[PDB]
Scaffold this motif. Structure first.
Motif, PDB file in Angstrom:
ATOM      1  N   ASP A  27       0.841  -1.199   0.000  1.00  0.00           N
ATOM      2  CA  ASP A  27       0.000   0.000   0.000  1.00  0.00           C
ATOM      3  C   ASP A  27       0.879   1.253   0.000  1.00  0.00           C
ATOM      4  N   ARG A  28       0.751   2.075  -1.028  1.00  0.00           N
ATOM      5  CA  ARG A  28       1.647   3.202  -1.210  1.00  0.00           C
ATOM      6  C   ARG A  28       1.321   4.374  -0.305  1.00  0.00           C
ATOM      7  N   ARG A  62      -4.696  11.421  -8.500  1.00  0.00           N
ATOM      8  CA  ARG A  62      -4.691  10.058  -7.963  1.00  0.00           C
ATOM      9  C   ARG A  62      -4.537  10.092  -6.448  1.00  0.00           C
ATOM     10  N   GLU A  64      -2.921   8.021  -4.419  1.00  0.00           N
ATOM     11  CA  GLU A  64      -1.519   7.827  -4.026  1.00  0.00           C
ATOM     12  C   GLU A  64      -0.684   9.095  -4.182  1.00  0.00           C
ATOM     13  N   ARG A 181     -15.595   2.737  -6.797  1.00  0.00           N
ATOM     14  CA  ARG A 181     -14.969   1.510  -7.358  1.00  0.00           C
ATOM     15  C   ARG A 181     -15.304   0.211  -6.574  1.00  0.00           C
ATOM     16  N   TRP A 217      -7.802  -3.368  -2.820  1.00  0.00           N
ATOM     17  CA  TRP A 217      -7.320  -2.193  -3.547  1.00  0.00           C
ATOM     18  C   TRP A 217      -6.094  -2.439  -4.416  1.00  0.00           C
ATOM     19  N   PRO A 218      -5.103  -3.177  -3.913  1.00  0.00           N
ATOM     20  CA  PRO A 218      -3.990  -3.471  -4.822  1.00  0.00           C
ATOM     21  C   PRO A 218      -4.436  -4.156  -6.111  1.00  0.00           C
ATOM     22  N   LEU A 220      -7.229  -3.808  -7.671  1.00  0.00           N
ATOM     23  CA  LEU A 220      -7.931  -2.838  -8.509  1.00  0.00           C
ATOM     24  C   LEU A 220      -6.973  -1.908  -9.229  1.00  0.00           C
ATOM     25  N   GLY A 221      -5.702  -1.935  -8.836  1.00  0.00           N
ATOM     26  CA  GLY A 221      -4.731  -0.980  -9.327  1.00  0.00           C
ATOM     27  C   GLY A 221      -3.625  -1.657 -10.074  1.00  0.00           C
ATOM     28  N   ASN A 222      -2.416  -1.187  -9.818  1.00  0.00           N
ATOM     29  CA  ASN A 222      -1.230  -1.561 -10.556  1.00  0.00           C
ATOM     30  C   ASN A 222      -0.152  -1.938  -9.534  1.00  0.00           C
ATOM     31  N   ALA A 223      -0.441  -2.981  -8.746  1.00  0.00           N
ATOM     32  CA  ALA A 223       0.344  -3.322  -7.562  1.00  0.00           C
ATOM     33  C   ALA A 223       1.596  -4.152  -7.846  1.00  0.00           C
TER      34      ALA A 223
ATOM     35  N   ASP B 219       8.863   4.075 -10.158  1.00  0.00           N
ATOM     36  CA  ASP B 219       7.844   5.080 -10.016  1.00  0.00           C
ATOM     37  C   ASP B 219       8.448   6.307  -9.255  1.00  0.00           C
TER      38      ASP B 219
END
Lengths: 245, 239
Positions: A27-28, A62, A64, A181, A217-218, A220-223, B219
């Motif tokens: 989690d960022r 975003r 993050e 979401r 959540w990860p 759903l994203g770009n983990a 990133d």
């Protein structure tokens, strides 16, 4: 409104211990908080995270990016009035510059509550998170299952585990944050209200809905899941499949 | 041009890359919250000294290390590694030799208190020389210089203070850094990057931190706009 034996099973297989790994290694937003904590007074750090959480909606960027933007802004910064700092912060931000009047009004509301709290009172709220939950529902005048209230508890728990050097699990009673979401993914499974649907999953699996939030959540994203053991990654791939992504 | 960009980023820009983007730093921040400070630093030194000829990616290895030692009582670091390496995913190679190196450093570490470590943080060239002495290595050994680098990370986290790496300590010179450097010069990376550092004012171990995020398509979204812009120009130059 059918339940889900397979979601219960995989979430139980992951466990709170798996959710903790995702929260702390993937989690960022957690990592943004780890940075701010190294550049801020512990008490102020926790209160800023509460105040920030209360205005983390209808962003202009975003999530993050927003939490990193918050972490950079308050790093090395002396804060007297949280309300006055946000007055300067939000309008000049990249990621949160819509609805500034309403959001500043919200920080004004919580600022009183927070002014009453010492660091020991916050350690008290970490040891007893349903109390904080209830106190935030009071001062903000929002629903028990308000996405912004429960997200504020979640983020308070991240800040506290950093500041108080220990892990305390979220209460089973606190519902999942139901943003667009989460409604969307849940609707592929059921027409049941997500907060109700995921409360039952959490109750049956033994994993609180706020920790379940951390698992979803990860996916759903770009983990980047490479910090995690192969067994945990495999379970998360199964969860991914069961959610229809 | 390379000098100018690097000078522009500076030690302060290197610091933000290390602390917001570097994946080893991330792993150590995790382990720190699940260990006692003195054991944490000692584990990081020992780990670094066996971080060569891996059976996986370096970043995966550091996470595997963090996971293994999280909340773990350690009676002997040497004993713990005898259990850890043979069952590891990412460092299951040359285990006899690696265990022997841990045996050697464990003797040196056992003499040290938390205050002694903090003193090595204040004198990192003394640690460098010390490790060359006990391990029997080269001054420009990748493994030794990278050990000082990770010790610096561990110490920054444990002591909540920044001390820049010494200008004298060379860049860790592996095949990836030789690839990058060969597009720029024929000189030996260790020599070239030392000169780049003296001229830019950015110690080579801090320069190392600038290159790897770029190598690895990291990133850079955590970083301030201005720093991210300087790094993109660096990426172009380096190709």
């Amino acid at each position: 409104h059918h339940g889900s034996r397979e979601l219960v099973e995989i979430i139980k297989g992951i466990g709170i211990e798996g959710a903790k790994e995702v929260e702390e290694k993937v989690d960022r937003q957690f990592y943004a908080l780890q940075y701010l904590f190294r550049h801020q007074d512990p008490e102020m750090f926790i209160k800023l995270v509460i105040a920030n959480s209360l205005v983390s909606y209808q962003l202009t960027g975003r999530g993050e990016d927003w939490w990193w933007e918050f972490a950079r802004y308050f790093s090395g910064r002396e804060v007297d009035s949280i309300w006055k700092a946000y007055g300067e912060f939000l309008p000049k931000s990249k990621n949160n510059r819509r609805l500034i009047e309403a959001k500043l009004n919200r920080i004004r509301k919580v600022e009183g509550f927070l002014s009453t709290l010492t660091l020991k009172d916050l350690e008290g709220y970490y040891k007893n998170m349903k109390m904080l939950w209830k106190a935030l529902i009071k001062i903000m005048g929002s629903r028990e299952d308000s996405k912004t209230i429960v997200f504020t508890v979640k983020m308070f728990g991240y800040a506290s585990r950093i500041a108080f050097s220990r892990f305390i699990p979220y209460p089973m009673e606190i519902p999942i944050p139901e943003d667009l979401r989460i409604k969307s993914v849940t609707s592929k499974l059921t027409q049941e209200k997500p907060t109700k649907f995921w409360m039952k999953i959490g109750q049956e699996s033994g994993v609180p809905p706020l920790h379940i939030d951390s698992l979803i959540w990860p996916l759903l994203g770009n983990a980047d899941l490479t910090p995690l053991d192969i067994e945990l990654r495999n379970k998360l791939m199964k969860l991914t499949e069961l959610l229809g992504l």
